[PDB]
Design a protein around this ligand. Structure first.
Ligand SMILES: CC(=O)N[C@H]1[C@H](O[C@H]2[C@@H](O)[C@@H](CO)O[C@@H](O[C@H]3[C@H](O)[C@@H](O)[C@H](O)O[C@@H]3CO)[C@@H]2O)O[C@H](CO)[C@@H](O)[C@@H]1O[C@@H]1O[C@H](CO)[C@H](O)[C@H](O[C@]2(C(=O)O)C[C@H](O)[C@@H](NC(C)=O)[C@H]([C@H](O)[C@H](O)CO)O2)[C@H]1O
Ligand SMILES: CC(=O)N[C@H]1[C@H](O[C@H]2[C@@H](O)[C@@H](CO)O[C@@H](O[C@H]3[C@H](O)[C@@H](O)[C@H](O)O[C@@H]3CO)[C@@H]2O)O[C@H](CO)[C@@H](O)[C@@H]1O[C@@H]1O[C@H](CO)[C@H](O)[C@H](O[C@]2(C(=O)O)C[C@H](O)[C@@H](NC(C)=O)[C@H]([C@H](O)[C@H](O)CO)O2)[C@H]1O
Ligand SMILES: CC(=O)N[C@H]1[C@H](O[C@@H]2[C@@H](O)[C@H](O)O[C@H](CO)[C@@H]2O)O[C@H](CO)[C@@H](O)[C@@H]1O[C@@H]1O[C@H](CO)[C@H](O)[C@H](O[C@]2(C(=O)O)C[C@H](O)[C@@H](NC(C)=O)[C@H]([C@H](O)[C@H](O)CO)O2)[C@H]1O
Ligand SMILES: *[C@@H]1O[C@H](CO)[C@@H](O[C@@H]2O[C@H](CO)[C@@H](O)[C@H](O)[C@H]2NC(C)=O)[C@H](O)[C@H]1NC(C)=O
Ligand SMILES: *[C@@H]1O[C@H](CO)[C@@H](O)[C@H](O)[C@H]1NC(C)=O
Ligand SMILES: *[C@@H]1O[C@H](CO)[C@@H](O)[C@H](O)[C@H]1NC(C)=O
Lengths: 322, 174, 174, 174, 322, 322
């Protein structure tokens, strides 16, 4: 007689899925929920370009390392890009205090503006032009950090400094200063004329006293001397008071800074690509809605959950037989 | 599967079926062809589409910035962050892998159930008016039009009409 | 549905049955009414009761003190704590949402199987003595008093008793 | 279970059957014994073994060194580590306990399904040549040797063997 | 003929759960496992009352800020409640060393008791009633922290202090002291008469020597001077030895302290409710057995896991149709 | 007629599993995936034996506490086993700076060898044999840490020390030195003859200046004096520069050190067992492939996930009926 049959779909498809009880099952249609693709470029994060320090560290950028490129106005950024080992960090050897907290705080900045707070004219009793070193060469000539001044004795005398700066701006100020550790007693007098010296820094919260550590040290960038740099945030209508009789690396520029959100520092050599994204990795940005990915763990932004997987394939069609 | 329809009585899978997931194949004196149960496939299509979107959309994502911000004298804290990142990766990997395995099993038995639910939909209309072959096919005890063929797919089959006709070949043909 | 019971061969729901979850509706010479299978309905209640309690009581909770104890020069550690709290929020949110979706689907398919299991139990007892209408009812070929109806509900159906009488209404009606 | 075989109409734990998981009980003239289905059981052994292995092998394990390396002036960081360890303890404990609970039911409904599948295979293998007793056993309408039953176990019985011969003894009992 | 049918329950049910394959599915019976309700009060934690500082920080409470309560009414607390920005922290500007670790230790205290270790009669050669400041007002008059004494020169002389205290109690002692940083040389000699001063504090484990940082600073609470406070735990039968020739903020009262468990500080403005709970949140206590909640992340106690959900409704009854 | 049935396996099994709707269900076969057994001994971790300090702390071992054992020349170790409270830590009271970071770094070392860098003949104008204390006895006589030398004045004179050591080895050197804090002015001049003293230590990265803190302290191990020790990692071809006119605890031995991986310190009293493992706990090693265990949280190696459970029984057989 007449015949009627019941059957399901099949197609030319070698797509594979796995189940809890059966391995290596071929299906008609399947979907992968594991993101594995990126654009290979560093992109803007939610419409804000990153601050790309080419080969400079944050400390060299902030202090004005002469080998680092001249300050270009980047009034805002969403994250900072450094190379794995920045070459130009501190041309004169030493340290920057609380460096990692400072780097974390500068990772995402809403407004960043460099201003002059103490011009080199404001040191009439001290030499302001001999503060140079072969460890900080510019155009082959000995130089120094741009944004600070290395004061030296004038007329074989170093009168005690007593200067203040009141923050009249509407925004917080990032201020950096330093102390120079000389190599021996003779070098201490040759530069500052005062054998025993100090530095005092005062604000509404900061109460700092520093003394030079005159000792024998190993040569770094050809110099046995050291400079220790320090920073503070001067809130509006507060003032910072400096006082020293030697070894003082005075600020000249400061930075008006407004901070709204948080980020981190990304280590990458990948180039900027004039794109936009909501999830960024050191190897490229991610444009996806998947819940999982396996590209890189050091992501910044709203990103899929990082897993150790090559594929997470979900069966949508029927079991396809050849 | 569990319901015994993909690897049970039906040992096929029709490549010529290209406008649906589940369907029918008819054989009468007017010809042959493939018909799609649009109702049955639509429930299945929305079911797996909703399952895919639920796994995607229930995932809560927040802004995070993951870096390496501790120096060489903060290794203990750095190790604490390492244990945290490894712990979440192990949690997410294990749950994501097992989610795929468990729900793939449900999907492959969802289609298995749908085929069976369609085989019984045809059977309960035909009853003893037709005969089962044992391979997911029915042999009628009467002539079937292209309208009666469309009636079995529709669900509007008329048992009494061909019931008295069916007896002319049930007990007569011995 | 997976088992094709709630929306399969049954296509409604009994507002008039107020004493159980699964049950029977009879219609004989003495009238009509509803009656619920006490055993299969209690097997269902204790099941979902256990499922709810298993989801609740398997959660391990410990004393914890959650605060913000790091100052403005410890923001990196504070950020480390932030990534930890957010990570556990994402884990618990995703696992809780999907557990609800997966078990609710299993819960509704649990009722389909129980309903389809109760239909098969009646189908096995009656055999040829009644005709399966298709919607989940059986048309008896004999006279079934209220204690033949209860005989079906308590699973003590006597086939030899009505075996010959059902033949008198089966083949003698042409 | 769901499909209704372990606690459905079979409702029997065959203590005397120790040769496998899924099998048959036969009672013909030549004797009475048991026999298992090689394909049905081996697909269940390979299923439960693959399920157990997938639960084990999917776990990503990494080298970790867990200690107490913070002093008495770093108690906040030690508390942060404590909340991290206790959070992961709670996450794994809940997932491990529920996964055992969830997949034990899927396991038992797998054995529950497979037993019913074997019954449905025999039902399609015998058809009108046999009756349905009710407890998973069939009443043949003809003489079945120890060679005709092996045609049923491997699934190769054909109507030429018993088409009218079964109809005789079927109608003799009237 | 006669009929028997198979069916399932239906009721007056408008309650919707979602499944993995379907959404907005109406069912007969359902249950939510997400806790959303709290009593809106701050309660005891397992029978122990919290230490509720009203508008005082921990530092002001310990040192005895004049605008903070003078008498400990609670010998034991389960957690500390502070407002977001307490008004009375350190009336005289300065700092408290290791403040966050000290706060964490004091979060849950089994026994606390203020005792007098060094009475004011122990300073016969020093002035003990002129150590007041307008930065610490009290009833329209300059005052000072109640639990420490600001020693001043007497008869234009500041003899060297050499005093020791032995912890004869059976419990640990929390002891606080301080150093005062002068504003200029003239102020230093006006208060202490000794131009170069020091503070030495020694126990079996403590070894501290401090010198004042005489420098110009911004006015805070009307004062340019500063006071740095420090603390230690003096174990039973150990002694603390003080030596100073000026700028010494001596202890008068100490605290017997017993710690047997850990907690944290809660920031909340909610009022005490004379209730008990095993799970407290800044917005209210939680009385529940549910595995999840969405009330607040900053919980103290045995609490459900915090999730970002508005509903977690489990289907218990059957599918319901109108 | 003839008969054929359908049935399933049952046997004499009492194994009980739980499922999400039914409890205490008997099955035929079941498999427990919770790891519960350990060998009760401390083992090698991936073929590398641990460093087992018996009753010596890390600090006492590095500095050569005479009350500890002698240097038994362990070349490499995978983790460090300390007792809960080591008896011999610092025979002369004091501290070791950055102790926890030092222990974390030393937790797993690929190569370790003590070498002499500054022989005792390098101190001709100073006494090298009087630096002993009854707090550090050896065979009843007063002694001192073996790896450093406590230098004392000679001929009532303490000439200023200026000595450098260049790291000509191809591995990093771990170097330790100390400063001794005198009890009073007379004891200072009795030992060093110079009333005001300092220690200067310099490398390419280290710039350290120390001064003694002369103060009254409680007796520890019979002594009121204190010794603060410090450490640095001297890179190959770098030099360390020491300068001091008193209170200097000079290095004599250093340690060539190569670090390839990381580990932690295990606190246990369990005996070494001449075994091998991939996962170690303070109560014993774990040899398993299971994903979960409940033995101990403080694990080192590739270990199962720690859970709070007594059994995770997976049902693999059918439902058993007796
Ligand atoms: C000026 C100079 O280069 N001096 C180096 C010194 O050179 C000597 C020798 O060669 C000597 C040989 O006998 O001859 C001297 O010249 C003689 C000549 O022989 C005669 O014929 C002639 O008639 O008289 C001459 C003298 O009048 C020649 O001057 O050699 C030593 C040994 O190699 C070398 O270290 C000297 O180089 C200077 O060393 C000092 C160390 O004290 C510093 O590192 C100097 O570096 C600088 C730097 O570039 O950073 C120089 C900067 O100008 C200076 N800046 C400031 C603000 O002071 C800084 C600063 O002093 C330190 O960094 C602070 O610690 O240092 C380095 O050039
Ligand atoms: C030398 C000695 O015994 N000194 C201890 C001193 O001894 C006194 C008392 O016993 C006194 C009792 O009235 O009698 C004196 O003897 C008299 C006696 O009265 C007469 O009967 C007799 O006829 O004439 C005698 C003449 O001497 C006796 O001299 O007692 C005090 C107080 O009890 C005790 O502290 C002295 O012990 C020394 O104390 C100093 C501190 O003052 C140190 O801790 C010394 O310990 C050591 C140490 O072992 O660490 C000694 C080491 O040799 C030394 N090492 C170096 C490199 O200098 C170190 C080091 O100085 C410190 O550690 C630096 O901080 O100190 C301890 O022996
Ligand atoms: C003593 C005083 O109030 N001086 C006051 C000064 O003199 C007024 C004068 O204007 C008025 O006309 O006559 C008055 C008497 O009739 C009185 O003599 O007025 C100038 C106006 O600009 C004020 O600057 C000056 O105020 C004092 O200035 C001090 C030095 O700068 C110091 O700040 C004083 O503050 C106290 C304080 O209240 O904290 C005064 C305390 O007694 C003192 N306590 C101790 C123990 O010494 C305290 C201490 O010196 C510093 O805090 C240490 O750094 O300072 C302030 O009143
Ligand atoms: C330690 O000694 C080595 C050589 O033994 C010094 O290394 C040399 O340094 C000079 C000076 O810059 C270089 O020109 C040579 O190329 C180096 N040679 C080698 C083989 O390294 C090293 O400078 C010394 N270190 C210190 C800190 O003085
Ligand atoms: C800075 O200037 C403003 C306005 O002139 C003044 O109110 C404020 O007190 C000054 N700050 C200090 C620290 O002197
Ligand atoms: C405190 O007094 C006890 C009384 O026995 C004494 O043993 C102990 O040494 C004293 N503590 C000191 C002096 O630090």
């Amino acid at each position: 007689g007449d015949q009627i049959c019941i059957g399901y779909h099949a197609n030319n498809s070698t797509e594979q899925v796995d189940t809890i009880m059966e391995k290596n099952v071929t299906v008609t249609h399947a979907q992968d929920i594991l993101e594995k693709t990126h654009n290979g470029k560093l992109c803007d994060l939610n419409g804000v370009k990153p601050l790309i320090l080419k080969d400079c560290s944050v400390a060299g950028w902030l202090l004005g390392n002469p080998m680092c490129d001249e300050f270009i106005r980047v009034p805002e950024w969403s994250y900072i890009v450094e190379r794995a080992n920045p070459a130009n960090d501190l041309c004169y050897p030493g340290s920057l205090n609380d460096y990692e907290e400072l780097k974390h705080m500068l990772s995402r900045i809403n407004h960043f503006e460099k201003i002059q707070i103490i011009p080199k004219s404001s040191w009439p009793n001290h030499e302001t032009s001999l503060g140079v070193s072969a460890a900080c060469p510019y155009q082959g000539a000995p130089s120094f950090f741009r944004n600070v001044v290395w004061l030296i004795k004038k007329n074989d005398a170093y009168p005690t400094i007593k200067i203040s700066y009141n923050n009249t701006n509407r925004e917080d100020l990032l201020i950096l200063w330093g102390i120079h550790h000389s190599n021996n007693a003779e070098e201490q007098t040759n530069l500052y004329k005062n054998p025993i010296t100090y530095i005092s820094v005062g604000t509404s919260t900061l109460n700092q006293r520093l003394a030079p550590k005159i000792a024998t040290r190993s040569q770094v960038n050809g110099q046995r001397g050291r400079m220790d740099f320090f920073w503070t945030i001067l809130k509006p209508n507060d003032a910072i008071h400096f006082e020293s009789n030697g070894n003082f690396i005075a600020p000249e520029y400061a930075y008006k800074i407004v901070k709204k959100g948080d980020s981190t520092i990304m280590k990458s050599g990948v180039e900027y690509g004039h794109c936009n994204t909501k999830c960024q990795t050191p190897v490229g940005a991610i444009n996806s809605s998947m819940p999982f990915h396996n590209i890189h763990p050091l992501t910044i932004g709203e990103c899929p959950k990082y897993v150790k997987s090559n594929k997470l394939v979900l069966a949508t069609g029927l079991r396809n037989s050849p | 599967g569990l319901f015994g329809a993909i690897a049970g009585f039906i040992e096929g899978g029709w490549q010529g079926m290209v406008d649906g997931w589940y369907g029918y194949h008819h054989s009468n004196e007017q010809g042959s062809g493939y018909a799609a149960d649009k109702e049955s496939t639509q429930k299945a299509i929305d079911g797996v589409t909703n399952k895919v979107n639920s796994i995607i959309d229930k995932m809560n994502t927040q802004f995070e910035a993951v870096g390496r911000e501790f120096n060489n004298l903060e290794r203990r804290i750095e190790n604490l962050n390492k244990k945290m990142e490894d712990g979440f990766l192990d949690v997410w990997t294990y749950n994501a892998e097992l989610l795929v395995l468990m729900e793939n099993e449900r999907t492959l038995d969802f289609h298995d159930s749908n085929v069976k639910n369609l085989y019984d939909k045809v059977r309960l209309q035909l009853r003893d008016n037709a005969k089962e072959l044992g391979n997911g096919c029915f042999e009628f005890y009467h002539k079937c039009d292209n309208e009666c063929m469309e009636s079995v797919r529709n669900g509007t089959y008329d048992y009494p009409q061909y019931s008295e006709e069916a007896r002319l070949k049930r007990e007569e043909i011995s």
